[PDB]
């Protein structure tokens, strides 16, 4: 017993809201899409193949769930979650005068069974030395102490932290490192007079 | 209480429809644990025994029992420093390395004494 | 080079948690050995192969439960059947040589 039912395109109202049809990421069933679309290479007299049974359209990632109406709606639903950005911070100058310390952190998304990315551990600490309370002696001693992690032209100190399994651990270790650098830059010792 | 469980099951049975949309599929899947959490953080699922960076970097505590001035300090401070840089290992494992060395050196006292340095 | 520079360097290593006391080029290898994942432990190494036993076994069973259909195994079968019919089979173990 052979059953052939006409496609949804027949029952489709002209003004029917589209995001109703493709709320989520979808394979592109040709039956559920109203637009005639021919893709494929043609043949000498012929045209591009029809949308029905077309394997090539099936390969295409389709942005059909993301049609701009659907985005407007989506975002307007998301306006409730987002929190505002503080006014006075609008310029970088004030950013530095208020917040001296930048912590860079990477997060990676790749498709597959496992989430685990080795590169995610790394935490980078960038800090201007002009925003620190250092003495002349202490500043010179810190510069010599850290060495290459200090850029002499831009005055931005860099701490790259790797060694620990978690990014939170590495964040703590970079902060700790910074703390200790500052505490041990101000201590004068015996051999410093030599 | 098996009866409370069959009650929660009989309730969850009237509660559970076959999914009415994709967003529903994804919601149930996420709560289930099948789907991923977003926005993605790769460290999700793994906290590493709630350890903190000082139980990683500073291994001095386990060198307490070991000869303090010898070449054994040299060697073991190298091993130590190595483990200090090692991301792929847990705290437990590092300590197990340390202890294997404790046990192996304390296994051979003889060869160490004969070696030309008296070693504890 | 000075004593000041060396004191500074010693302090730098001790601080950042790198090797404190002066070592040979040859001995530093030790640190390297524990800094890394030993070669035979990497997932690229011990996990290299897919388990072929699980694939072959599982799809065999699923064939016998009549879910999976293996045309290759079917071909092998029918060929073999026709071969035992024609009279050349596989000798039962121990029988072939001496007899």
């Amino acid at each position: 017993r052979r059953k052939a039912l006409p496609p949804r395109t027949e029952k489709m109202a002209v003004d029917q809201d589209w995001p109703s049809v493709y709320p989520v990421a979808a394979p592109f069933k040709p039956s559920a899409v109203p637009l005639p679309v021919r893709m494929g290479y043609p043949v000498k007299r012929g045209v591009p193949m029809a949308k029905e049974g077309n394997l090539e359209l099936l390969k295409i990632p389709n942005f059909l769930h993301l049609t701009p109406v659907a985005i407007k709606r989506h975002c307007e639903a998301l306006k409730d979650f987002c929190t505002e950005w503080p006014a006075a911070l609008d310029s970088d100058e004030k950013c530095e005068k208020h917040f001296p310390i930048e912590i860079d952190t990477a997060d990676y998304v790749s498709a597959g069974p496992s989430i685990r990315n080795p590169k995610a551990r790394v935490v980078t600490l960038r800090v201007k030395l002009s925003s620190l309370n250092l003495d002349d002696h202490a500043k010179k001693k810190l510069i010599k102490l850290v060495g290459d992690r200090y850029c002499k032209s831009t005055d931005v100190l860099t701490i790259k932290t790797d060694r620990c399994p978690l990014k939170r651990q590495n964040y703590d270790y970079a902060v700790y490192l910074l703390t200790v650098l500052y505490h041990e830059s101000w201590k004068t010792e015996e051999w410093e007079k030599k | 209480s098996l009866w409370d469980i069959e009650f929660a099951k009989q309730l969850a049975a009237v509660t559970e429809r076959p999914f009415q949309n994709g967003f529903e599929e994804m919601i149930q899947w996420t709560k289930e644990g099948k789907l991923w959490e977003f926005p993605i953080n790769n460290e999700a699922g793994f906290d590493d025994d709630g350890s903190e960076f000082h139980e990683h970097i500073f291994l001095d505590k386990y060198l307490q029992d070991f000869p303090k001035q010898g070449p054994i300090r040299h060697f073991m401070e190298l091993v130590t420093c190595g483990l200090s840089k090692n991301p792929y290992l847990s705290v437990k494992q590092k300590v197990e390395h340390i202890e294997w060395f404790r046990n192996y050196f304390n296994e051979k006292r003889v060869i160490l004494k004969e070696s030309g340095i008296q070693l504890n | 080079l000075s004593e000041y520079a060396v004191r500074m360097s010693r302090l730098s290593a001790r601080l950042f948690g790198e090797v404190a006391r002066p070592t040979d080029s040859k001995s530093m290898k030790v640190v390297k050995l524990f800094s890394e994942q030993p070669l035979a432990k990497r997932k690229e190494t011990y996990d290299w192969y897919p388990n072929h036993n699980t694939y072959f076994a599982l799809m065999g069973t699923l064939r016998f439960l009549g879910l999976y259909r293996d045309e290759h195994q079917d071909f092998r079968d029918e060929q073999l059947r026709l071969k035992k019919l024609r009279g050349k089979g596989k000798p039962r173990k121990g029988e072939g040589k001496r007899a």
Partner: peptide, 18 residues
């Protein structure tokens, strides 16, 4: 030659480092 004393423990407990 020279062996200088660096205190791991002092800076440790102080900075939450032990």
């Amino acid at each position: 030659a020279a062996a200088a004393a660096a205190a791991a423990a002092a800076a440790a407990a102080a900075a939450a480092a032990a």
